[PDB]
């Protein structure tokens, strides 16, 4: 679940489905919490390599 | 970005949109992620804090 995967998801396109736009904008949150979090770790992980 | 938030945003309906299982299955995927990434900082700071 890379960001260049989420922010390329497509998915199947059918009458009266979700709105595209509304989706994706929900999406690049998703993604943008996992990198920050993936962040947080590197940080954790670092103050008990030095430690 | 709790599950339930995730789980339960909502999405207009246009005329040709996405599927919409498919997002929900994507999103579901998504917050089994984050919430995996938390319990990963969570275990990182109790080490930090155990010394």
Do not use: W
């Amino acid at each position: 679940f890379t960001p260049n995967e989420i922010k390329n998801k497509e998915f199947s396109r059918v009458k009266n489905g979700l709105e595209p736009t509304e989706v994706a904008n929900f999406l690049e949150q998703l993604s943008t919490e996992i990198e920050r979090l993936k962040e947080d770790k590197k940080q954790l992980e670092k103050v008990i390599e030095e430690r």
